[PDB]
């Protein structure tokens, strides 16, 4: 059993390496196979898995015909989170009955999510007095407000969306809780074109540098 | 006892490996590298899967591969093969999936809906450009050209359909022209073909 144990350990190390290569750990797998000939064979694979921060369950029944393969059906369960768009995207992929694009989209969504949460934690750590946790580091939006003067506030909203083909893309927009007192004070009125300008600035020099410069201007 | 537990662990990890094969991509570690298997599918239709050999040594080299050459990878290799290998694999997976979907749409059209087609379709190996002609039954002739210049997606960005030899006489004809334009620009090919033909 020693040689078998060593071979199993080597295979387990290989499986862990591949799991790191995909970023997804499949906890369980149950296989069933039936044959229905007039040679059609239906195979059902139940599996629970998880990405870095997320856990999922899914089962799918696929058909193989004597030399084509196509998934007959599938069901899939997420966990309840704020990002309800993930659930509707899961549903849409369920009608699409597509797996590879679904998993790549989920990994990309978590990769952007981890990036967003890490950036939020870093900016909160940098300046913890001008950074307010409106809903949390794992939320969609952040808000910077001056403690001495609560009239101003600036909220950056970040939402990750999925294209119909399966492409993923983030989106960031600004909004200012600004009194008309300050608007009356200065007649320059550049806040009208603020969203597009800030988007261009972020595209020029990223998100973290943009927010760092923004909070530097708030000194 | 111990043998039974070892067998149970082995069959569990084998089932997990099969599940890993059934999703995303596959990889089988070897002595000289990993013969990484990439899987392709579209609209719940399993498609042909490829594989590429790897060398784990620092001078990263591809000593063997099965991906067709017309798919650009050497530029992507210079881009992200040395650095951020994960993005390299994700991008190549997307590109192969898009190519497989395009080829599946093309040969599905050739095999199934050739009934209303009046001529062979001209297709590139990468299937970025498609040019064909079709008759729909009143009977109207059309000739369509699709530009899949966005390589990462399976949907064209610019499509143009027209006819030569007939002068415009019915606004309804231009209406079906625009409808087909939108159908190619938005929805898959065989799907909209089965949609209007039926």
């Amino acid at each position: 059993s020693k040689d078998l144990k060593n071979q199993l350990g080597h295979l387990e190390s290989e499986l862990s390496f591949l799991s790191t290569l995909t970023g997804i750990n499949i906890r369980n797998h149950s296989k069933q196979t039936e044959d229905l000939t007039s040679r059609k064979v239906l195979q059902r694979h139940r599996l629970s898995g998880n990405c870095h921060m997320v856990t999922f369950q899914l089962e799918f029944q696929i058909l193989e015909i004597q030399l084509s393969s196509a998934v007959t059906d599938l069901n899939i369960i997420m966990e309840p989170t704020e990002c309800s768009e993930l659930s509707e995207f899961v549903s849409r992929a369920e009608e699409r009955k597509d797996l590879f694009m679904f998993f790549r989209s989920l990994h990309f969504f978590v990769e952007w999510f981890e990036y967003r949460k890490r950036t939020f934690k870093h900016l909160k750590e940098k300046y913890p007095d001008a950074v307010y946790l409106s809903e949390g580091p794992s939320s969609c939006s952040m808000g910077i407000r001056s403690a001495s003067r609560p009239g101003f506030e600036l909220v950056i909203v970040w939402r990750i969306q999925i294209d119909e083909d399966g492409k993923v893309f983030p989106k960031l927009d600004l909004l200012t809780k600004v009194p008309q007192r300050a608007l009356e004070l200065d007649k320059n009125r550049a806040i009208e074109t603020a969203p597009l300008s800030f988007r261009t600035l972020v595209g020029l020099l990223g998100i973290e540098a943009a927010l760092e410069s923004l909070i530097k201007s708030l000194c | 006892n111990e043998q039974e537990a070892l067998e149970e662990k082995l069959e569990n990890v084998k089932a997990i490996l099969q599940a890993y094969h059934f999703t995303g991509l596959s990889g089988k570690l070897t002595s000289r590298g990993v013969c990484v298997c990439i899987s392709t599918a579209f609209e719940g239709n399993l498609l042909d899967s490829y594989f590429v050999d790897l060398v784990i040594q620092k001078p990263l080299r591809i000593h063997h591969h099965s991906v067709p050459v017309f798919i650009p990878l050497e530029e992507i290799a210079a881009k992200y093969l040395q650095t951020n290998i994960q993005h390299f694999l994700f991008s190549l997976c997307e590109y192969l999936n898009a190519y497989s979907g395009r080829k599946y749409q093309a040969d599905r059209l050739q095999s199934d809906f050739a009934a209303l087609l009046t001529g062979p379709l001209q297709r590139n190996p990468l299937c970025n450009l498609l040019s064909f002609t079709y008759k729909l039954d009143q009977s109207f002739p059309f000739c369509a050209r699709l530009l899949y210049k966005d390589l990462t997606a399976t949907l064209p960005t610019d499509v143009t359909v027209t006819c030569q030899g007939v002068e415009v006489l019915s606004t309804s004809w231009e209406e079906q022209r625009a409808s087909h334009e939108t159908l190619f620009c938005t929805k898959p090919l065989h799907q909209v073909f089965a949609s209007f033909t039926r």
Binding site: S16, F17, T20 | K58, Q82, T83
Partner: peptide, 11 residues
């Protein structure tokens, strides 16, 4: 980098 990540996970 990629090499350092691969070596850190291989160990």
């Amino acid at each position: 980098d990629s090499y350092e990540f691969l070596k850190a996970i291989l160990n």
